[PDB]
Chain length 420, copies 2
């Protein structure tokens, strides 16, 4: 059974139970089938992974695992012991069984052991390598829980760039593919952490070394790695030819829950297709518009508002066409500040485009869905403030920002080394 859905696997404030239940509704509404629970800073998932859940947390996880069953989403419970586990100490192993047993009595039946970060001297004696230590404990938790239907394993070398010396010849992956039990699945993020493309030939290459088709943990829409970035563009860079070669695809999307309508809608479109990223974004935006109401009044947002907004917060390696256009046009205006009529005519057209950013922010702050507006607020306010300043500046040619973080970044020479 091919797994396709969402992993909540980013850093920072995790989602809340009501947001996750609502996630289960949209996964079901769009015919996806999986949720992987792995919030990096939900303290009992990784930092304090040994602490069992309290009476009140047990009641919230049981309720959340029941909702996943109600909406026919498979619930996968992950745990990340890798930061301070002692693999050779029986009580660490018993604690890891005791804590999965407690989640198992909450209704959960599928699990994952993740090893995404960074070996003690006591385990150098018992285990021949880091890959042997993880595979030993993963296999033993696997068999100890009755060999569950779905059990996932995220390796430490979880992408091409993290493979040493490379994918095909890695000591680490080779031990994993040889000694990890055939029934356990392997997570893989592609050639990179955030893969621009995931080529079929790269998936073939990792499948030989790990001896099975991987489950993609996809970071295409993840935004936890830069405060100013948001990704509302379509699922893209993965050919539908990957589907016969994969055990599943689970996206790790933006931290702000309401901003992942497009990211999950288009992945669902891609899973059912063969696939046009631009057509997928138009179906996702057209459906999304219905959620931007006007408050009922007893005493606004357009489709082109959302097209502009997505083009300004698109994808990690690409801007949408309206974003690249306004940025190409402002480069030309700045560079060329007869030819005089051209400059003013194109400056006039560019201030109008700036006005459309201001107008999209204004109608978005009038919408009835306060949740969507709050999740995206700082991003939309920021792009509006800047374009209001850019617009002023274009007019001028015609007449501490960022904090300490910003001041250090301007002093690095690769500051705008990827600008257009």
């Amino acid at each position: 059974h091919f797994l396709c859905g969402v992993v909540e696997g980013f850093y920072g404030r995790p989602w809340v139970m009501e947001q996750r239940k609502e996630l289960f509704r949209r996964l079901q509404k769009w015919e996806l089938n999986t949720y992987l629970y792995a919030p990096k800073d939900d303290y009992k998932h990784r930092m304090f992974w040994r602490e069992m859940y309290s009476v009140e947390e047990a009641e919230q996880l049981m309720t959340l695992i029941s909702a996943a069953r109600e909406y026919e989403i498979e619930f996968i419970y992950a745990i990340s012991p890798g930061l301070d586990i002692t693999f050779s100490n029986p009580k660490e192993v018993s604690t890891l069984k005791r804590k999965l047993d407690q989640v198992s009595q909450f209704g959960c039946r599928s699990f994952a052991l993740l090893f995404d970060d960074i070996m003690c001297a006591a385990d150098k004696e018992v285990f021949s390598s880091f890959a042997h230590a993880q595979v030993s404990i993963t296999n033993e938790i696997y068999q100890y829980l009755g060999e569950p239907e779905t059990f996932l394993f995220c390796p430490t070398e979880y992408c091409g760039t993290f493979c040493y010396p490379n994918v095909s010849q890695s000591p680490y992956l080779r031990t994993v593919g040889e000694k990890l039990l055939p029934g356990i699945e392997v997570l893989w993020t592609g050639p990179k952490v955030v893969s621009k493309e995931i080529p079929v030939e790269s998936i073939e290459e990792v499948s030989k070394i790990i001896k099975r088709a991987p489950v993609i943990w996809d970071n295409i829409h993840a935004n936890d790695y830069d405060q100013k970035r948001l990704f509302l563009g379509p699922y893209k860079g993965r050919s539908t030819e990957l589907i016969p070669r994969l055990k599943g695809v689970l996206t790790n999307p933006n931290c702000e829950f309401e901003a992942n309508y497009v990211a999950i809608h288009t992945l669902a479109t891609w899973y059912k297709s063969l696939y046009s990223p631009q057509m997928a974004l138009k179906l996702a935006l057209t459906e999304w518009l219905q959620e931007f109401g006007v408050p009922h009044q007893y005493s606004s947002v357009t489709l082109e508002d959302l097209q502009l907004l997505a083009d300004l917060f698109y994808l990690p390696y690409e801007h949408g066409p309206k974003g690249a256009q306004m940025l190409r046009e402002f480069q030309w205006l700045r560079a060329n500040s007869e030819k005089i009529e051209e400059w003013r005519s194109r400056a006039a057209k560019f201030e109008e485009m700036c006005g459309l950013v201001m107008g999209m922010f204004t109608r978005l702050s009038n919408c009835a869905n306060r949740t969507i507006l709050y999740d995206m607020y700082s991003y939309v306010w920021d792009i509006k403030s800047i374009m209001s300043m850019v617009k002023s500046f274009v007019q001028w040619l015609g007449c501490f920002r960022g904090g300490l973080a910003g001041e250090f970044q301007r002093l690095l020479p690769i500051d705008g080394a990827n600008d257009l």
Copy 2:
């Protein structure tokens, strides 16, 4: 009778009732006394100011107004009609009376009309005449309440036209606003670095009363990457005898305003910014869990104040400016010794992030996580760059070798526009 406390007055996600009750608890713990409710994006506070609250919204306001009394915090309800009100039309005035009447039946006794953002040319001779007419009539209609506030459109020095002393607008306001109504003022600027004593006497003369400061010193709603954990600073305690109050508009992240409100509380002793911050940091440390006192000293110095970095922050930046400026040399032992010590200081940022993400107080950590991770990753890159600069006596490789992850290039499309501004 001096009002001092918090205005929740920023843009974006408002606080939830659980955070607000906890704010009242701290206002009381630290001897402050006032809360002004004015979140710009509570749709019924401003955008749809005429719409009554629903049965469930009403019940939430009553419970919260009751908690303010339990904690003896004065609750002031604000409203902003200025974006689309027709001041000269009676039905509009009634709409605003009925809407304040409804909050008044929730237990609320203090109010504010904010004007910080037609056919009225016929009835009113200026915009100040329009607002003061409706402000005075609302004021008396509610029985001249104990506290009634008025935020003018020219609410700071730079917003005054042509200047403070000569503004038609403020002088109309000072002449025609009833003595029982108070006037809000942010100082010489929206975010004032200092609020000089003579500026307050100058503004008090034209508005004919002592102002209540709406203080934006710690607001961070106007820049995504900014957080302000430094002490209340730039206002002499001499202002306390010439002010009717001070209400600070702090960071949008609720847990990040421990220092901002604690230090204002310390200052309300009718004052040393550095000493106030050592009291606030020592107390704040207790709410975590591990995090050390010098961690929070470092953290406050990296997110200090809108016009200043903390001493540990300003130090790492001039030192890295000098290292960058004199890298050509790589006599020469000076540059390497200072590069090692500066690499050591970056470690203290990394170590402060690590213990903060292992701390038991998850609420505080989630409020600041995006800010702490951003500074830690930049300094990790800044440390890498200094290492690269000293490793060049023996390597010709470039700083970035090959194909990068997206976080090597920061800011998205917004960042690309800002780099294009001079």
